[PDB]
Design a binder for this molecule. Structure first.
Ligand code: MG
Ligand code: MG
Ligand code: MG
Ligand code: MG
Ligand code: MG
Ligand code: MG
Ligand code: MG
Ligand code: MG
Ligand code: MG
Ligand code: MG
Ligand code: MG
Ligand code: MG
Ligand code: MG
Ligand code: MG
Ligand code: MG
Ligand code: MG
Ligand code: MG
Ligand code: MG
Ligand code: MG
Ligand code: MG
Ligand code: MG
Ligand code: MG
Ligand code: MG
Ligand code: MG
Ligand code: MG
Ligand code: MG
Ligand code: MG
Ligand code: MG
Ligand code: MG
Ligand code: MG
Ligand code: MG
Ligand code: MG
Ligand code: MG
Ligand code: MG
Ligand code: MG
Ligand code: MG
Ligand code: MG
Ligand code: MG
Ligand code: MG
Ligand code: MG
Ligand code: MG
Ligand code: MG
Ligand code: MG
Ligand code: MG
Ligand code: MG
Ligand code: MG
Ligand code: MG
Ligand code: MG
Ligand code: MG
Ligand code: MG
Ligand code: MG
Ligand code: MG
Ligand code: MG
Ligand code: MG
Ligand code: MG
Ligand code: MG
Ligand code: MG
Ligand code: MG
Ligand code: MG
Ligand code: MG
Ligand code: MG
Ligand code: MG
Ligand code: MG
Ligand code: MG
Ligand code: MG
Ligand code: MG
Ligand code: MG
Ligand code: MG
Ligand code: MG
Ligand code: MG
Ligand code: MG
Ligand code: MG
Ligand code: MG
Ligand code: MG
Ligand code: MG
Ligand code: MG
Ligand code: MG
Ligand code: MG
Ligand code: MG
Ligand code: MG
Ligand code: MG
Ligand code: MG
Ligand code: MG
Ligand code: MG
Ligand code: MG
Ligand code: MG
Ligand code: MG
Ligand code: MG
Ligand code: MG
Ligand code: MG
Ligand code: MG
Ligand code: MG
Ligand code: MG
Ligand code: MG
Ligand code: MG
Ligand code: MG
Ligand code: MG
Ligand code: MG
Ligand code: MG
Ligand code: MG
Ligand code: MG
Ligand code: MG
Ligand code: MG
Ligand code: MG
Ligand code: MG
Ligand code: MG
Ligand code: MG
Ligand code: MG
Ligand code: MG
Ligand code: MG
Ligand code: MG
Ligand code: MG
Ligand code: MG
Ligand code: MG
Ligand code: MG
Ligand code: MG
Ligand code: MG
Ligand code: MG
Ligand code: MG
Ligand code: MG
Ligand code: MG
Lengths: 151, 234, 138
RNA sequence: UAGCGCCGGCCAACUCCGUGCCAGCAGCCGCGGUAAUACGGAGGGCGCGAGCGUUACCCGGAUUCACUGGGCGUAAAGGGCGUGUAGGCGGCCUGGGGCGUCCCAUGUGAAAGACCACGGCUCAACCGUGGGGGAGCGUGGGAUACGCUCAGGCUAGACGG
RNA sequence: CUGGUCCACCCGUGACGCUGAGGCGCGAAAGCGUGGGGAGCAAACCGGAUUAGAUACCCGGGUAGUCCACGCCCUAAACGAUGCGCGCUAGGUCUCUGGGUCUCCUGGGGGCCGAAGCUAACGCGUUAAGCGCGCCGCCUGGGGAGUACGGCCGCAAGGC
């Protein structure tokens, strides 16, 4: 129902007497291009089944994202153990400038202006997971004063 | 009432197996055993029962869980006597988490309930009859109390949190509210509505479940008198 | 010997928040005060107050937190997510007003010493003064 | 007048013949051992166009010398261990100085150049005019919280009975 | 004869602290010098046996050495493969040592399991690999190599 877009479909494998069989990684992002977004990573002995499966998980794990005219509120750095990612706010006409992964994220996020970089590791998977969290830690001016109130 | 009653033979428990977090509830440590704060318990049941209450007046279904022996039947009785779902038997991976599939089994007990009362054993050799029926027995031996649940619980009552903590996780993830009796051997923070106090002895267990269910029934309609349990206490 | 009493305090607060204590104390000191005072005024802590441990001037610092969360790990969101000393003893930092940092695009604060006093990043610009960039907090 | 590079992957562009670890390609991974989208020719396609490719060197990517912005149990990395010189760093209270530091004022920071605006040559490159800021240092004035520094007090550090 | 460390009392000093390039001292074993000592053990060395061969594993024998004094050498899986100092951050249990009328507590040490958290994972976790600051040492693809040249030290082997 939202939008759909996969980042990669790798074929892993495994040993076993007489040969090797393979499952199939499949990372997919999904979003309404309007704040609601969710990432998903499915696995199965079939490419289609795999993407299909990533679809189910995608809409499950979701996250609202505080969009200021297509940009992000404040800048944030979030290290998912291995890799690390930066995210910066930018005026209209800047565009989504990032590696292929965080793009899928931010694009299907409804984001349209943002400076970013992948420092550290770069494993697509981990950078994925990383960004999700990062957005999941963005906070609107309200959230701030709302917590910083406690009336 | 709810005061001196619990204040009676239902307070304090355990020693040297405790989350320092649950310690905000302990009064002292006499005889080497943790003396839970009597008053603090009542204060809690207030907020709790207010949710217990509100939750019933909504008509919402509570899932009871107590696989621990010292409460196995003490759940059975109080839940049946409340039209609510319960599990005193062994819990299962996905009770709520993998619902649909666990439910396939409930349906299977319906299918088995057909032939368990139908003129269709003109067929079915004596052999098949044996196992097929034997199934039904344990089919009920784990589902009979869960089988009445058909939607998906609105909350979960738990005898001992740490013990059947697996449930708590299932529930918690599905954003299902947690309520439970819990001694010092417990993790106070991951319970949404806490019933601090003894939970290894029949005394506190029967007392809590009693008034708990009575509250459910009263918020509903037709309050009566507690089932056998005082003799069960012996 | 304790190197930097300031970094310590900041740290004491960070180490305490993570476990969600109600209040950690800290060795008292006039300059240390201001940090709290501001840190509190901006809404980062319910407050503070002088105390005394076995004949030692200290400071209770009543920590703030967010509401409970629903779902796995009902971990209450923090009120102080981030705190870090900038100018250390082994590297003093000094900034002109014409160049004072904006913490988390303004969501954040950047307390700093100055000739007029300890002031927020904004209050710095207010009275138009630069000084020793102490630390930032968000 | 229309040319040049490319069309296995990175990388935008696919078929056919020839060929057969040879002829050859190559920046990395690799490609050719009779059936090659990877050699070579053809048809077609992608890219740019009075150009297009190559070689060479500089900065980038390279947060791969990390101030911004990294590390050191096992991946490269804690000195064999101690005593200690130099240097580095330094707890709580008050006071004088004001070195560092912050502020203001002025001098300087040529022109050209960079950015903005507007005008000139049909446009443009190029050019004129005007505008702004600029690190840095010189003089003067001012603030004193943190650093320093002299001075005074304390006992939580360290030492001692 | 002498070094360190821990506890009680809160008596004295009054920030005298921390770290530490170079320097200096210590530094298993093997090894070197002069003199001594020599039971057992034992490189090398000899014989037996095994094997295709067996300069080895096994067996019989056996010298330096291993022991002491004095001197030199200065290397190591000198290993927790984790520099030191300080502050902070749940507990459970075992044990060594001290103080206290004590199933308890309070300190200093050595172990295991674990909060939070850190980690690439294994794992670490108030004996941190967590959170912080000071100071030193070290790293910057595998090979060539801890080699070569130079310099310094050493009787030499050889070390830096
Ligand atoms: Mg739609
Ligand atoms: Mg939709
Ligand atoms: Mg589709
Ligand atoms: Mg998963
Ligand atoms: Mg499905
Ligand atoms: Mg919202
Ligand atoms: Mg939002
Ligand atoms: Mg890392
Ligand atoms: Mg790569
Ligand atoms: Mg890689
Ligand atoms: Mg949000
Ligand atoms: Mg929000
Ligand atoms: Mg119902
Ligand atoms: Mg019948
Ligand atoms: Mg029949
Ligand atoms: Mg239900
Ligand atoms: Mg439901
Ligand atoms: Mg909590
Ligand atoms: Mg009986
Ligand atoms: Mg709290
Ligand atoms: Mg305010
Ligand atoms: Mg090209
Ligand atoms: Mg290209
Ligand atoms: Mg292509
Ligand atoms: Mg030929
Ligand atoms: Mg041929
Ligand atoms: Mg061919
Ligand atoms: Mg072939
Ligand atoms: Mg090619
Ligand atoms: Mg070709
Ligand atoms: Mg052509
Ligand atoms: Mg041209
Ligand atoms: Mg380069
Ligand atoms: Mg380079
Ligand atoms: Mg660089
Ligand atoms: Mg690195
Ligand atoms: Mg270190
Ligand atoms: Mg190297
Ligand atoms: Mg050392
Ligand atoms: Mg040394
Ligand atoms: Mg070493
Ligand atoms: Mg050495
Ligand atoms: Mg020392
Ligand atoms: Mg010194
Ligand atoms: Mg000082
Ligand atoms: Mg000094
Ligand atoms: Mg001083
Ligand atoms: Mg002064
Ligand atoms: Mg002066
Ligand atoms: Mg000026
Ligand atoms: Mg200049
Ligand atoms: Mg000037
Ligand atoms: Mg000028
Ligand atoms: Mg100029
Ligand atoms: Mg330039
Ligand atoms: Mg003009
Ligand atoms: Mg013009
Ligand atoms: Mg013309
Ligand atoms: Mg000009
Ligand atoms: Mg000008
Ligand atoms: Mg300039
Ligand atoms: Mg100027
Ligand atoms: Mg100057
Ligand atoms: Mg002064
Ligand atoms: Mg004097
Ligand atoms: Mg003094
Ligand atoms: Mg003392
Ligand atoms: Mg002695
Ligand atoms: Mg005396
Ligand atoms: Mg005195
Ligand atoms: Mg001093
Ligand atoms: Mg030696
Ligand atoms: Mg020797
Ligand atoms: Mg010799
Ligand atoms: Mg000798
Ligand atoms: Mg000789
Ligand atoms: Mg002689
Ligand atoms: Mg001799
Ligand atoms: Mg002999
Ligand atoms: Mg012998
Ligand atoms: Mg021999
Ligand atoms: Mg022999
Ligand atoms: Mg022979
Ligand atoms: Mg022989
Ligand atoms: Mg022998
Ligand atoms: Mg002797
Ligand atoms: Mg002798
Ligand atoms: Mg002698
Ligand atoms: Mg060191
Ligand atoms: Mg020392
Ligand atoms: Mg004792
Ligand atoms: Mg006592
Ligand atoms: Mg006593
Ligand atoms: Mg005493
Ligand atoms: Mg006793
Ligand atoms: Mg005991
Ligand atoms: Mg105790
Ligand atoms: Mg003891
Ligand atoms: Mg200990
Ligand atoms: Mg101990
Ligand atoms: Mg452990
Ligand atoms: Mg954990
Ligand atoms: Mg400790
Ligand atoms: Mg401690
Ligand atoms: Mg411990
Ligand atoms: Mg420590
Ligand atoms: Mg670590
Ligand atoms: Mg590590
Ligand atoms: Mg190298
Ligand atoms: Mg090389
Ligand atoms: Mg090399
Ligand atoms: Mg080497
Ligand atoms: Mg090398
Ligand atoms: Mg060597
Ligand atoms: Mg050498
Ligand atoms: Mg040379
Ligand atoms: Mg040479
Ligand atoms: Mg040499
Ligand atoms: Mg010589
Ligand atoms: Mg010799
Ligand atoms: Mg060495």
């Amino acid at each position: 129902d939202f939008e759909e877009k996969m980042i990669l479909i790798r074929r892993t494998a495994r040993m076993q007497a007489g040969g090797r069989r393979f499952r199939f990684g499949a990372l997919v992002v999904v979003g309404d291009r309007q704040g609601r977004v969710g990432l998903g990573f499915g696995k199965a002995p079939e490419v289609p089944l795999a993407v299909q499966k990533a679809g189910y998980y995608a809409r499950r794990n979701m996250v609202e994202v505080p969009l200021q005219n297509g940009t992000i509120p404040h800048e944030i750095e979030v290290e998912f153990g291995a890799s690390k990612i930066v995210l910066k706010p930018a005026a209209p006409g800047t565009g989504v400038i990032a590696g292929a992964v965080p793009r899928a994220i931010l694009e299907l996020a409804g984001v349209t202006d943002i400076l970013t970089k992948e420092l550290g590791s770069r494993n697509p998977i981990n950078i994925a997971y990383a960004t999700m969290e990062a957005l999941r830690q963005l906070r609107t001016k309200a959230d701030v004063e709302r917590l910083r109130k406690g009336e | 009432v709810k005061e001196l009653l619990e204040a009676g033979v239902h307070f304090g428990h355990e020693r040297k197996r405790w989350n320092p977090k649950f310690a905000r509830y302990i009064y002292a440590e006499r005889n080497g055993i943790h003396i839970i704060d009597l008053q603090k318990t009542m204060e809690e049941l207030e907020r709790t029962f207010r949710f217990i209450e509100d939750l019933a007046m909504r008509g919402g279904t509570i899932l009871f869980v107590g696989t621990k022996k010292q409460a196995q039947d003490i759940v059975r009785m109080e839940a049946e006597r409340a039209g609510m779902p319960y599990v005193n038997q062994r819990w299962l991976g996905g009770m709520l988490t993998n619902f649909k599939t666990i439910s396939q089994r409930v349906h299977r007990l319906e299918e088995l309930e057909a032939l368990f009362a139908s003129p269709e054993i003109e067929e079915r050799p004596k052999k098949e009859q044996v196992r097929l029926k034997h199934e039904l027995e344990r089919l009920q031996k784990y589902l009979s109390g869960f089988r009445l649940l058909k939607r998906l619980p609105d909350a979960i009552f738990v005898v001992d949190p740490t013990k059947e903590a697996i449930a708590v996780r299932e529930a918690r993830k599905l954003f299902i509210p947690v309520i439970a009796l819990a001694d010092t051997d417990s993790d106070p923070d991951l319970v949404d509505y806490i019933i601090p106090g003894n939970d290894d002895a029949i005394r506190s267990i029967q007392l809590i479940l009693s008034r708990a269910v009575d509250l459910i029934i009263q918020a509903r309609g037709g309050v009566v008198e507690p089932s056998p349990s005082y003799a069960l206490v012996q | 010997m304790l190197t930097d009493p300031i970094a310590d305090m900041l740290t004491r607060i960070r180490n305490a928040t993570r476990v969600y204590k109600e209040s950690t104390d800290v060795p008292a000191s006039r300059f240390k005060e201001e940090i709290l005072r501001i840190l509190a005024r901006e809404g980062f802590i319910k407050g503070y107050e002088r105390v005394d441990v076995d004949g030692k001037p200290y400071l209770r610092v009543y920590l703030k937190y967010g509401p409970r969360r629903q779902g796995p790990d009902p971990r209450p969101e923090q009120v102080i997510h981030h705190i870090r000393r900038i100018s250390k003893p082994g590297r003093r930092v000094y900034v002109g007003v014409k160049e004072i940092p904006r913490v988390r695009r303004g969501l954040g604060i950047a307390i700093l010493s100055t000739s007029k006093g300890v002031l927020t990043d904004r209050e710095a610009r207010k009275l138009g003064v630069g000084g020793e960039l102490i630390c930032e907090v968000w």
